[PDB]
């Protein structure tokens, strides 16, 4: 959980170009696929668990 | 002074942080 967004998965550190006004990322299927650290700026791709 | 141009593409923003 980062800023109220809960979930489960594996973080893989992507280089997705999140802009300053972007904190969450949803894929083509309206499914979360990336998030930003509320403290640092690292963009982590929420990949699915096994 | 006060003329009237049309708003071509003017009038769209970002209603999200996605």
UniProtKB/Swiss-Prot annotation, chain B:
Function statement: Attaches the virion to the cell membrane by interacting with host receptor, initiating the infection. The major receptor is host ACE2. When S2/S2' has been cleaved, binding to the receptor triggers direct fusion at the cell membrane. When S2/S2' has not been cleaved, binding to the receptor results in internalization of the virus by endocytosis using host TFRC and GRM2 and leading to fusion of the virion membrane with the host endosomal membrane. Alternatively, may use NRP1/NRP2 and integrin as entry receptors.
Provenance organism: Severe acute respiratory syndrome coronavirus 2 (2019-nCoV)
Known partners and oligomeric status: Binds to host ACE2. RBD also interacts with the N-linked glycan on 'Asn-90' of ACE2. Cleavage of S generates a polybasic C-terminal sequence on S1 that binds to host Neuropilin-1 (NRP1) and Neuropilin-2 (NRP2) receptors. Interacts with host integrin alpha-5/beta-1 (ITGA5:ITGB1) and with ACE2 in complex with integrin alpha-5/beta-1 (ITGA5:ITGB1). May interact via cytoplasmic c-terminus with M protein. May interact (via N-terminus) with host bilirubin and biliverdin, thereby preventing antibody binding to the SARS-CoV-2 spike NTD via an allosteric mechanism.
Protein name as annotated: Spike protein S1
Lineage: Viruses, Riboviria, Orthornavirae, Pisuviricota, Pisoniviricetes
């Amino acid at each position: 959980n980062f800023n109220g967004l809960t979930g489960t998965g594996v973080l893989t550190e992507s280089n997705k170009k999140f802009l300053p006004f972007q904190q969450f990322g949803r894929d083509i299927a309206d499914t979360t696929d990336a998030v930003r650290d509320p403290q640092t700026l690292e963009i982590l791709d929420i990949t699915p668990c096994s | 002074t006060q003329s009237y141009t049309n708003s071509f593409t003017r009038g769209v923003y970002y209603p999200d942080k996605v």
